[PDB]
């Protein structure tokens, strides 16, 4: 009875996904699983998977192509083609099996409050160049370090924003309290609707498609080939409205994310009872 270490990045959403994995593995295989919530950021999840410290983690397709793949391929904005380059690229580079993606897109999103976008005429990311000497931005450290992040805001848009580096769990409160007026939101985050935040349109298309999918070593899939069929029951499933409600239940209502993942997969017929 092997026990697989399933970890996630920071936030309720990868903890929900890791528990969804654990529920499907424990029911449909002879293995158990342990969920490591908020295990780290993208690179730490990536190097722990290659080092064998963790077994599965939900990785996003544009994050493979931009951060994990070196040199980064020039991909399209079609999510199926971004997945195919990410799956073939991460198998070529690090021998990691990238299973089939989910339906929803959880992208990076430049978000300002609803008052600020109407006060300053902000509708797209290019509109931040009008006002970049006025508002203060609060970004996560990884978004600052990423070429599909604040570095791409500098490179593709010309935006040299007044950026304060933030922890991920404190950026939504600070945009709510008014200490910052720009933050790196995630598309399926419940704090977008909870804090009246208006997502600015990616008019120059800096951000690639970002669909989540299980990422694991190829050797683990060769040892356990049932892991492919079991976890691909989530493939092409879970909408943006469904995932944002799961983040609302765990992150805001304080529900246990193993329970939140269990009721959802039972409601969709993906889990027993
Ligand atoms: C889904 N996403 C928005 C595209 C990001 C979110 C994220 C980046 N770093 C951490 S931690 N979370 C990612 O996982 O790459």
Swiss-Prot record:
Protein location: Cell membrane
Record keyword Transport present: yes
CC annotations in GO: ATP-binding cassette (ABC) transporter complex
Key words of the record: Cell membrane, Membrane, Transmembrane, Transmembrane helix, Transport
GO biological-process terms attached to the record: amino acid transport; glycine betaine transport; quaternary ammonium group transport
Gene Ontology MF terms: ABC-type quaternary ammonium compound transporting activity
Main location: membrane
Region span, Ergothioneine binding domain: 1-273
Assembly, per entry: The complex is probably composed of at least an ATP-binding protein (EgtUA) and a transmembrane protein (EgtUBC). Probably undergoes significant conformational change when bound to ergothioneine.
Functional description taken from the UniProt entry: Part of an ABC transporter complex EgtU required for the uptake of ergothioneine (EGT), a natural low-molecular weight (LMW) thiol antioxidant. Responsible for the translocation of the substrate across the membrane. Also contains a C-terminal periplasmic solute-binding domain (SBD) which binds to EGT with sub-micromolar affinity. Binds L-hercynine about 10,000-fold less tightly than EGT. Cannot bind the structurally similar compounds L-histidine, proline-betaine, choline, ectoine, carnitine or dimethylpropiothetin.
The record's note on its domains: In EgtUBC the transmembrane domain (TMD) and the solute-binding domain (SBD) are fused.
Family listed: In the N-terminal section; belongs to the binding-protein-dependent transport system permease family.
Protein name per UniProt: Ergothioneine transporter EgtUBC
Native species: Streptococcus pneumoniae serotype 2 (strain D39 / NCTC 7466)
Lineage: Bacteria, Bacillati, Bacillota, Bacilli, Lactobacillales
């Amino acid at each position: 009875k092997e026990n697989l270490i399933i970890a996630g990045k920071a936030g309720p959403e990868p903890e929900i996904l890791a528990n969804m994995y654990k529920l499907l593995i424990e029911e449909n295989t002879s293995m158990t699983a342990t969920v490591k919530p908020n295990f780290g950021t993208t690179s730490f999840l990536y190097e722990a998977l290659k080092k064998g410290d963790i077994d599965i983690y939900p990785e996003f397709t544009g994050t493979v192509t931009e951060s994990l793949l070196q040199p980064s391929p020039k991909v399209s904005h079609e999510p199926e083609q971004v997945y195919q380059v990410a799956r073939d690229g991460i198998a070529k580079q690090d021998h990691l099996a990238y299973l089939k993606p989910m339906s929803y897109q959880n992208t990076y999103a430049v978000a300002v409050p609803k008052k600020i976008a109407q006060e300053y005429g902000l509708k797209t990311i290019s509109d931040l160049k009008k006002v970049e000497g006025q508002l203060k931005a609060g970004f996560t450290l990884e978004f600052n370090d990423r070429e599909d992040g604040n570095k791409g805001l500098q490179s593709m848009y010309g935006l040299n924003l007044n950026v304060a580096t933030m922890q991920p769990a404190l950026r939504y409160q600070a945009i709510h309290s008014g200490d910052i007026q720009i933050t790196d939101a995630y598309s399926t985050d419940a704090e977008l609707e909870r804090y009246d935040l208006q997502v600015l349109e990616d008019d120059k298309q800096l951000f690639p498609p970002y669909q989540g999918a299980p990422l694991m070593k190829e050797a683990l899939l060769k040892k356990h080939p049932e892991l492919e069929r079991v976890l691909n029951t989530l493939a092409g499933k879970i909408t943006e409205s469904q995932m944002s409600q799961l983040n609302y239940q765990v992150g805001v209502e304080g529900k246990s994310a193993k329970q939140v993942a269990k009721e959802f997969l039972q409601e969709q017929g993906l889990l027993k009872k």
